[PDB]
Structure 1
Amino acid sequence: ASKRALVILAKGAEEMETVIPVDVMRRAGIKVTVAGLAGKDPVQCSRDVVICPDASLEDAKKEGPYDVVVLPGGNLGAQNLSESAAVKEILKEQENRKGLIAAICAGPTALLAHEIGFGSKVTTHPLAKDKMMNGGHYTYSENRVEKDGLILTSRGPGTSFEFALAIVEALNGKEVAAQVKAPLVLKD
């Protein structure tokens, strides 16, 4: 009866946008798998924080399905996610089974690369807007967190806590999110 989350970690990922949702989701009792795009080896993030994934993406793919797939940001991390056929397969499957997809900052641009969620309202980092809107396939929002159907997006490292708590609320409900939030000493 435990919810499962998949976090896809690629080189160049924004380490804050990776660790905050993983940490907060585990505080909420969610079983999180941090999967390395390139394998089990340690991943050098955009500001040179090196994180050891729990599993390779190939192995984590086999232990699905997941209630949420999480795409961190980081310009180079998002590009690696956009170019990966394994990610395309995971996202299309997640879209078909009406699972939640979450991406933050530059992460949403991978949704465009893989033709995911066209027609949805989305947000990105302001610097990634032009890339996300190429072709007019989405409607752009400037909300710090945006949720349209099964697509949940957020803007930047400074929105990571709201992004993560929105995932908790979608999976475990508003009360669990509120309980998890109080010991964090967030402003609002």
Structure 2
Amino acid sequence: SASALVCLAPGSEETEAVTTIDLLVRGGIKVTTASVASDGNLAITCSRGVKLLADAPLVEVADGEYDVIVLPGGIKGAECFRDSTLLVETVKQFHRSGRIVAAICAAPATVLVPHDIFPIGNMTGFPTLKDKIPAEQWLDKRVVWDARVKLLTSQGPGTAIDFGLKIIDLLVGREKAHEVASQLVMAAGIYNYYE
């Protein structure tokens, strides 16, 4: 079975994190949540005060064989990720070992750009943080999949469904992505993977 490592830090965006986890589980993907930048504490207070319990400290799962590492947004959570040497090294290791990096909202600009992880990759993120992403790399699009570098990015709380569905498509296929999308009562405008 496919698997995903979803990172959480103080100040992570809870709608982004939780919607993604839920969709991945609906897609049959095994999800582990990891606490980042908390010295092992598993209780994470998210950006609007929602309190989540992570499964494990990052340092205990960073070497696992997950197919994708997921970086939720939330400006303070993304800063924690950026400033965690373990988080940054783990993202680089996922990439170098042929796996997927997935990041939403503030995470592309705050984590990926300062560390030059994908120097010529195409990416999106929260629109009013556009200028934190190099102009030659920026696209203003609900989801961007750069297949060359296996980088999936997305824009905000309202694109979390689109983001999760594309992870499902990539790890377990279009039919499963459509099956999950069909469970949700999705808004018009969001791609449902039927075609």
Question: TM > 0.5 between the two?
Answer: yes
Normalised by the shorter chain, which TM-score bucket?
over 0.9
Alignment check: 8 A CA contact 2:106 2:125 kept: yes
Report matched runs for 1:1-188 at 5 Å.
2-37=1-36, 38=38, 39-62=40-63, 64-109=64-109, 110-133=111-134, 139-149=137-147, 150-188=150-188
Matched residues, number: 183
In structure 2, stretches of 5+ residues that fail to align are 189-195
Shift >4 Å, 4+ stretches: none
Query: Retained in 1: the 8 A contact 2:104–2:154?
Result: yes
Q: Give CA deviations for 1:142-174 in whole Å, capped at 9, x if unaligned.
A: 111001120100011000000000000010110
Shift of the alpha carbon at 1:107? 1.0
Greater helix content = 1
Cα offset, 1:41, TM superposition: 2.4
Please tell me whether the aligned partners of residues 122 and 144 of structure 2 are also in contact (alpha carbons under 8 angstroms).
Answer: yes
Give the gaps of 5 or more residues in structure 1.
none
In the alignment, residue 144 of structure 1 is paired with which amino acid? Answer: R
Kept after mapping to 2: 8 A contact 1:40/1:54: no
Pairwise CA distance, 1:181:
1.1
Q: Secondary structure at the match of 1:35?
A: strand
Report the TM-score, using the length of structure 2 for normalisation.
0.90
Q: Distance in 2 between matches of 1:118 and 1:66?
A: 24
Distance 1:114 1:32 in 2: 26
Report the TM-score when normalising by structure 1. 0.94
Give the Å deviation of 1:67.
0.5
